[PDB]
């Protein structure tokens, strides 16, 4: 019915956005109404970790601890809503913005825009303080 583990929904194939058809078919088999929660923010800010907490799990969306970017594209986890019977909670984990090894800088805008369009709740993840750059 639901997913035991998250899957990649949208891949960065070369430098073009491509949808994973397996994840789409599992998502379209989902018959219940969906509450869709997406996270977005700079890379290396603990987004993936926080999304696993919304799934109520210690592991799920992959977490790494190097200076390099980890999460790529957009990953989807369709889980039961923990309080509403007959509703589905969808978690969308995103590639982090501002990757200094990423050539396709415009893909950051594309992932952000998709996260806004596909969600009902948008989690903007920043570090330390409210920055003017983050507002802009």
């Amino acid at each position: 019915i639901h997913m035991t583990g998250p899957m990649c929904l949208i891949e960065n194939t070369n430098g073009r956005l491509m949808a994973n058809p397996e994840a789409l078919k599992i998502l379209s088999a989902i018959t219940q109404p969906m509450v869709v929660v997406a996270i977005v923010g700079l890379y290396r800010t603990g987004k993936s970790y926080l999304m696993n907490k919304l799934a109520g799990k210690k592991k799920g969306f992959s977490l790494g601890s190097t200076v390099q970017s980890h999460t790529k594209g957009i990953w989807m986890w369709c889980v039961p809503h923990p309080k509403k019977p007959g509703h589905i909670l969808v978690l969308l984990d995103t590639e982090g913005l501002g990757d200094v090894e990423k050539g396709d800088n415009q893909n950051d805008s594309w992932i952000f825009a998709l996260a806004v369009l596909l969600s009902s709740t948008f989690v903007y993840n920043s570090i330390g303080t409210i920055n003017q750059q983050a507002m802009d």
Partner: protein, 151 residues
């Protein structure tokens, strides 16, 4: 802020509050905040402490709650509780409630629209300057030519 303690929500609202005045010195400041006020009327802020000792951040998901900061464990629970209690079912125009198939349709519609060029790109601030100044340079050069030939 200004000698008064504020909540995280009051801190977020203060940062995003538009300046009063309507003058030129306030236009740039007010431009992102008028948009954010319009597109995101309902806002919430959450603070999270540093989650553990700095040497144990790399293994954070493998640690038990007593090795993390206690305030961080509580703050994560409060965040998750708020998301579960206040998040709505996704909607579309015409009173339509989004389910799996409709969400799949939205993914395909927007991915295809991006791949066909419908989404503008934010350019580098230097290339943007060159585009403006060089275009103006062509116009000045043409105006000089027209003046010289016309005389």
């Amino acid at each position: 802020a200004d000698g008064q303690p504020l909540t995280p929500d009051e801190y977020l609202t203060y940062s995003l509050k538009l300046k009063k005045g309507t003058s030129q010195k306030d236009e740039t400041f007010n431009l992102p905040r008028l948009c954010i006020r319009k597109f995101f009327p309902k806002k919430k802020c959450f603070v999270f402490d540093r989650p553990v000792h700095r040497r144990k951040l790399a293994q954070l998901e493998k640690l038990q709650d007593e090795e993390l900061d206690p305030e961080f464990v509580q703050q994560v629970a409060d965040f998750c509780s708020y998301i579960f209690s206040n998040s709505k079912t996704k909607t579309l125009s015409g009173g339509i409630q989004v389910n799996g198939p409709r969400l799949e349709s939205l993914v395909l519609t927007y991915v295809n629209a991006i791949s066909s060029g419908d989404l503008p790109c934010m350019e580098n601030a230097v290339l943007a300057l060159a585009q403006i100044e060089n275009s103006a340079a062509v116009q000045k050069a043409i105006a000089h030519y027209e003046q010289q030939m016309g005389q």
